[PDB]
Every structure is written in structure tokens, then in C-alpha cells.
Amino acid sequence: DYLFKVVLIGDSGVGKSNLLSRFTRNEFNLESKSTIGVEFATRSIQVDGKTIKAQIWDTAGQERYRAITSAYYRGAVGALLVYDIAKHLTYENVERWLKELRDHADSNIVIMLVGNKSDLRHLRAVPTDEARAFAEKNGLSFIETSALDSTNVEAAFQTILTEIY
Numbered sequence: 698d699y700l701f702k703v704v705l706i707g708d709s710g711v712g713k714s715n716l717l718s719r720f721t722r723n724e725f726n727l728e729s730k731s732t733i734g735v736e737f738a739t740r741s742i743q744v745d746g747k748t749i750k751a752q753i754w755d756t757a758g759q760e761r762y763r764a765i766t767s768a769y770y771r772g773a774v775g776a777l778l779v780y781d782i783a784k785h786l787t788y789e790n791v792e793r794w795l796k797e798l799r800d801h802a803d804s805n806i807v808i809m810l811v812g813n814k815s816d817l818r819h820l821r822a823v824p825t826d827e828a829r830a831f832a833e834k835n836g837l838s839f840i841e842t843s844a845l846d847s848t849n850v851e852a853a854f855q856t857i858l859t860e861i862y
């Protein structure tokens with residue numbers, strides 16, 4: 698009975714924890730209940746008429762010691778690389794996360810670029826187009842999600858799990 702390991706990465710405050718709670722329990726929390734360290738939780742999904750088990754990992758990013766960083770990426774078959782569409786700096790940091798994946802993760806890890814906080818359209822600072830072309834260029838999948846209103850959260854996880862299984 699195998700649990701596919703999928704890691705969340707991206708700047709602190711982008712809603713990674715909320716994506717986790719959406720995917721595992723379909724919950725949202727305005728007051729962040731983000732891990733102070735590393736956390737994981739499990740989900741069962743029907744992909745291609747089959748049952749797939751996934752463990753989604755999340756990190757505060759407060760610990761950089763080599764043993765935990767190696768442990769976080771060890772065995773990961775998928776990564777959701779998350780930014781906040783209302784913060785250009787989070788989008789700029791995606792290259793840093795892409796680099797971290799190359800440095801510590803399996804070279805064949807499937808990567809999905811996720812623009813979270815789609816609900817805040819008025820405060821948008823990252824055009825869909827730009828992000829999309831970056832993704833295409835770097836060989837990533839791309840989706841915009843809202844943890845708050847649940848838009849595309851399941852779809853995001855489904856897509857990655859389809860390539861992983």
C-alpha cells in the first residue's frame with residue numbers, strides 16, 4: 698500500500714498550508730494553521746478509475762539544516778511550486794524554488810507551477826500570461842487556484858497525480 702509523495706514549496710505566506718488542508722480535508726482557514734516546521738497528510742483519490750494514495754508535505758521554511766532538507770525532498774515524485782498572484786516577489790522566488798528542486802530533488806520530479814490567491818483579482822500583480830509562458834518555457838504544468846474559494850485546488854492535485862501514478 699503505497700503513498701505517493703508530493704511536496705509543496707514556495708515563499709512563506711503563499712497559502713501552501715491552505716492548499717494542503719483543502720486537498721486533505723477540504724478545509725480553509727483565514728487564521729493560518731501553517732506548520733511551524735514540516736508536516737504531511739494523506740489523501741485517497743480516484744485517478745483513471747483507480748485508487749491512488751498521496752502524502753502531501755508542507756514546510757514552514759524555518760529549518761535549513763541538511764538532514765531535514767534532504768528528508769523533505771527524499772522520495773518526492775511531485776512538487777507543487779506555489780506563488781501568490783497578488784505578490785510579484787513570490788513569483789520572482791519561483792526560480793529560487795525551481796533551483797532548490799534541482800539541488801535536492803529527484804531530477805525526474807514532476808513540477809506544477811501554482812498561482813494561489815486567484816480570488817484577490819483586484820490586487821493581482823502577476824498576469825496569468827507571464828506566469829504561463831514561464832511555466833511552458835521551464836517545462837512545468839500551470840494552474841491558478843484559490844484556497845479561499847476552492848477554485849482549481851482539486852484540479853491542481855489531480856493533474857500532478859495523473860502524471861505521477
Ligand SMILES: Nc1nc2c(ncn2[C@@H]2O[C@H](COP(=O)(O)OP(=O)(O)O)[C@@H](O)[C@H]2O)c(=O)[nH]1
Nearest residue numbers: 709710711712713714715727729814843844845
Ligand atoms: N485571499 C486568499 N487568501 C489565502 C488563500 N490561501 C491562503 N490565504 C491566506 O494567506 C495567509 C497565509 O496562508 P498560509 O497557508 O499560512 O501560507 P503558507 O505559509 O504558504 O502555508 C493566511 O492568512 C490564509 O488565510 C487564497 O487562496 N486566497
